[PDB]
């Protein structure tokens, strides 16, 4: 059935190359080879986590006949009120070692042994502000002791937390910021999304003045909103036997947000 073949596709996930994404990859790579720590900030739906995954995936673990995987980039996300015992466990699991029972100093001594030997060049911490302040002592120590760049990713609250401590604010002084789309950039994106992602039999011509007004008001430049809304509109539209997104269906969806 053609209709289900398509619905199964539209309801999926993909990464679209964008300027923000390319910028980050080049910036982080600069930083990785210079071994310097930094942070990335921006508003909650700009597509920060995805830009980071796109990067991780371009640098796969490497494997020889004998020794452990070489793992240039490690990516983790901490739980709420994450403590020092919790971070060593995730670093150790990520690199595929078994975590056994012991106390904090034992997880620490073990984390430094697996981080060594196994080439690790960069550590990326998502939602950085979930960390308890005491953990930052352990994060800085690693960044200083091992040639590992540490990148903190987060929202504007992160800076409110980071500026509470001079020592940390200084390790992580350099930053890159993500923001909203606008003007020509938002319009060209919309067009990309139509030709590159939706691909309906006829298509809708969403760069017309009438449709961009609807999308602009509905999405306010967040890539997260634009994606959800166009996909909810294409699958609704197909379920009803249409070959394109029109104004009434698009407004019908937009009014639900």
């Amino acid at each position: 059935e053609w209709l289900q073949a398509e619905i199964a596709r539209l309801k999926g996930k993909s990464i679209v190359p964008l300027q923000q994404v390319k910028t980050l990859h080049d910036w982080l790579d600069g930083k990785r080879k210079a071994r310097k720590s930094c942070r990335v900030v921006g508003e909650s739906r700009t597509g920060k986590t995805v830009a980071c995954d796109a990067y991780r995936y371009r640098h796969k673990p490497q494997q020889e006949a004998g020794r452990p995987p070489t793992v240039p980039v490690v990516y983790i996300r901490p739980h709420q009120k994450c403590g020092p015992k919790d971070l060593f466990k995730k670093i150790t699991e990520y690199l595929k070692y078994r975590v056994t029972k012991g106390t904090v100093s034992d997880f620490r001594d073990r984390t430094i042994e697996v981080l060594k030997g196994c080439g690790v060049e960069m550590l990326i911490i998502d939602e950085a502000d979930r960390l308890k302040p005491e953990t930052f002592a352990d994060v800085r120590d690693i960044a200083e002791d091992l040639g590992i760049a540490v990148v903190l990713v987060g929202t504007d609250r992160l800076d409110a937390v980071i500026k509470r401590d001079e020592q940390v604010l200084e390790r992580f002084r350099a930053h890159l910021r993500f923001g909203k789309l606008s003007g020509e950039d938002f319009k060209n994106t919309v067009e990309m999304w139509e030709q590159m992602v939706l691909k309906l039999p006829v298509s809708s011509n969403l760069k017309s003045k009438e449709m961009l007004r609807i999308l602009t008001s509905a999405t306010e430049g967040y890539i997260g909103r634009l994606d959800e809304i166009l996909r909810e509109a294409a699958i609704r539209s197909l379920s009803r036997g249409l070959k394109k997104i029109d104004k009434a269906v698009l407004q019908e969806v937009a009014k639900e947000y």
């Binding site: 996930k13 990464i15 679209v16 190359p17 796969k60 490497q62 494997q63 990309m192």
Partner: peptide, 14 residues
């Protein structure tokens, strides 16, 4: 412009 399927990048992971 090529677009990457998210699940693909994951299924091909080390």
């Amino acid at each position: 412009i090529e677009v990457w399927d998210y699940e693909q990048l994951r299924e091909e992971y080390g």
